[PDB]
Paper text:
Vaccinia virus, the vaccine used to eradicate smallpox, has about 200 genes, and many of these encode proteins that help the virus evade the host's immune defences. This paper concerns the vaccinia virus proteins A52 and B14, which block signalling pathways leading to the activation of the NF-κB transcription factor and thereby diminish the host immune response to infection. The structures of A52 and B14 are entirely α helical, both comprising seven α helices and adopting the Bcl-2–like fold. We show that both proteins are Bcl-2 family members but lack a surface groove for binding BH3 peptides and, consonant with this, are not anti-apoptotic. Instead these proteins have acquired the ability to inhibit signalling pathways that activate NF-κB.
VACV strain Western Reserve gene B14R is an immediate-early gene that encodes a 17-kDa cytosolic protein (B14) that contributes to VACV virulence and inhibits the IKK complex. The interaction of B14 with the IKK complex depends on the presence of IKKβ, and B14 bound to the IKK complex prevents phosphorylation of the IKKβ activation loop. The structure of SeMet B14 was refined to 2.7 Å resolution with residuals R/Rfree = 0.223/0.244, residues 8–149 being observed in the electron density. Four molecules of B14 are present in the crystallographic asymmetric unit, forming two dimers with highly conserved overall folds (0.11±0.02 Å rmsd over 142 Cα atoms) and dimer interfaces. Despite being a cytosolic protein, and despite being purified and crystallised in the presence of the reducing agent β-mercaptoethanol, a single disulphide bond is observed in B14 between cysteine residues 15 and 46, locking the N-terminal loop with the α1-α2 loop. There is no obvious functional role for this disulphide bond other than stabilising the structure of the protein. Superposition of our structures onto that of myxoma virus M11 in complex with the BH3 peptide of Bak reveals the hydrophobic BH3-peptide binding grooves are occluded in both A52 and B14, but not in N1. Equivalent residues (63–66 and 82–90) occlude the groove of B14, helices 2 and 4 again being much closer to each other than in M11 and three side chains (V64, F65 and Y90) pointing directly into and blocking the groove. However, only B14 is able to block signalling downstream of TNFα/TRAF2. This is due to the ability of B14 to inhibit signalling from the IKK complex via its interaction with IKKβ: the nexus where IL-1 receptor, TNF receptor and TLR signalling pathways to NF-κB converge.
Author numbering:
A (entry chain A), B (entry chain C): 8 to 149
């Protein structure tokens, strides 16, 4: 028995209202639930590919995740805004942010439980994204 | 191997910067981790007593948790703002909100895995509380 995201099996999202819950549960699921429960949907295929958009924006995300202050959400957001400064973000920048946070969540997670740091990855993303960003990234999720 | 909140054993908080991280992990821990990790600190004793402040403000929190739309964070916040309308909240109202969300998280959680609803309880609280609220409730956590 392991956390099962609502959209785990989904190939697409219907409403744009599902966008925040979806990204949230994705990042939480990347903590540890991923190695016990898989998600074959086309939706989770797309999400995982955001790692590519992350690498494109942050260059080396492995070395970046290790460095960043995951104990401090506010400061992490400040660091991200070095790479993505504007409040108006592009669809690639938004994917990068989700991509980075999901990687951080996997890096910092335990095998069967989450950690303070892996949870904080979830809140860094929330800090970063506004409602206008959710409309845009929605276009990659159908 | 269960989630272990950073402040699980703590009797107090040192910095006001720990306040958001603490409440967050408390609410997550109320999902299911509470049955496998005991938190004897005076801090968690105080937090759990916020159920009293919840009952005081929302009358019957059991019947209220069942009714509310936990699938919809925005709407849950709207419902709460019926009871606590002002942006300037009192220390009792802030405790009520934490109290209610922790109860909701326990109600909706599974036995070994959180649920979409139990997680949403966490986000309802985040929706409700601003930084000025964290300074106030900090006075109950030392």
């Amino acid at each position: 028995h392991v956390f099962s995201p609502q959209h785990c099996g989904c190939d697409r999202l219907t409403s744009i209202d599902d966008v925040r819950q979806c990204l949230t549960e994705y990042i939480y699921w990347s903590s540890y639930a991923y190695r016990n429960r898989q998600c074959a949907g086309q939706l989770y295929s797309t999400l995982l590919s955001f790692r590519d958009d992350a690498e494109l924006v942050f260059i080396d995300i492995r070395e970046l995740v290790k460095n960043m202050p995951w104990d401090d959400v506010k400061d992490c957001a400040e660091i991200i805004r070095c790479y993505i400064p504007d409040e108006q973000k592009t669809i690639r920048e938004i994917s990068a942010i989700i991509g980075l946070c999901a990687y951080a969540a996997t890096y910092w997670g335990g095998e069967d439980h989450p950690t303070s740091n892996s949870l904080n990855a979830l809140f860094v993303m929330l800090e970063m994204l506004n409602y206008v960003d959710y409309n845009i990234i929605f276009r990659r999720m159908n």
